[PDB]
Amino acid sequence: PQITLWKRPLVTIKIGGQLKEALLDTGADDTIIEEMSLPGRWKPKMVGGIGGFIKVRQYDQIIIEIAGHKAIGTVLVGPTPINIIGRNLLTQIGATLNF
Amino acid sequence: PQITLWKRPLVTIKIGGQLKEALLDTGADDTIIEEMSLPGRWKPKMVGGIGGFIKVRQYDQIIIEIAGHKAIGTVLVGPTPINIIGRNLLTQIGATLNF
């Protein structure tokens, strides 16, 4: 699909058998979702935003469905105001910015 | 142009007669530029995201050239780590997210 930006580009994702809302975020290097239970061991990572840095838990090779497209990659878990799908997974679904 | 997301989608912009590099960010409601001088009166505003909130100055009716495309809208000025072009101006250049 082609998505205009008059409204926030929110989509439905499926992770860990749950449906959650997420923002398609070209301004994010990585993908971050709010606190949830994910399988496997995690590693520590620090990420920065407009207001500074936060500590998140990094999980690898997580299966996640984004607006119907399956992706398998790195997901960070932490205190983010909203679930964000970043470039790491956007490239997997073949997303591009056009104008 | 069609912009892939293997890398950060940065583009050249022209504001206040100055050339700057900016990030095309579908995850940003507004446009935030690094500390610089702009004409007119402004209002204080607080914007947030990952890491918390920061204080910016809001200037309205500012003309900005985004990668060649002239647009007009509100521009926030503050201590941002990177110049961000949000949806308020992305819509004006007809930018879309395709996948």
Ligand SMILES: CCCC[C@H](CC(O)(O)[C@H](CCCC)NC(=O)[C@@H](NC(=O)[C@@H](NC(C)=O)[C@@H](C)O)[C@@H](C)CC)C(=O)N[C@@H](CCC(N)=O)C(=O)N[C@@H](CCCNC(=N)N)C(N)=O
């Ligand atoms: C420095 C600012 C870079 C811009 C983006 C912003 C954004 O991710 O698009 C987020 C996503 C939405 C909320 C989480 N948008 C925002 O943060 C924007 N917020 C908003 O639009 C709304 N705010 C809220 C809280 O809803 C609006 C209501 O104000 C603001 C820019 C203000 C309009 C951002 O935070 N990117 C992080 C995402 C986290 C991540 N790791 O992917 C990033 O890539 N950080 C990189 C490097 C960033 C560049 N380097 C640096 N010097 N910090 C990193 N690896 O840590």
